[PDB]
């Protein structure tokens, strides 16, 4: 009478997406000139902003709900003339902004 026609089913293959980590700019420092007992500035909101003194003392902190940070200078390190203060804000996923290493002193 006639022939038979059947259809064909197959499984979809697994894939993945890709992305660049941090895309923006480096966290702004305020002029923390030696006698200034606190390092302040603007950074990524609620991001773990690691304060890296060029002495090597790293005072780990986190920026506020607002896009700023306040991390007081610990009584051991001094910002003497020649210190290039490095600040590094790190997003909650782990996307660190550029290291603002700047001689305020």
TrEMBL record:
Domain of life per record: Bacteria
Subcellular location(s) of the protein: Secreted, Cell wall
Positions that bind Ca(2+) 7: 91
Compositionally biased region (Polar residues): 30-50
Biased composition (Low complexity): 55-65, 96-105
The protein's name: Biofilm-associated surface protein
Gene: bap
Shown segment, full-protein numbering: 2066 to 2146 of 2276
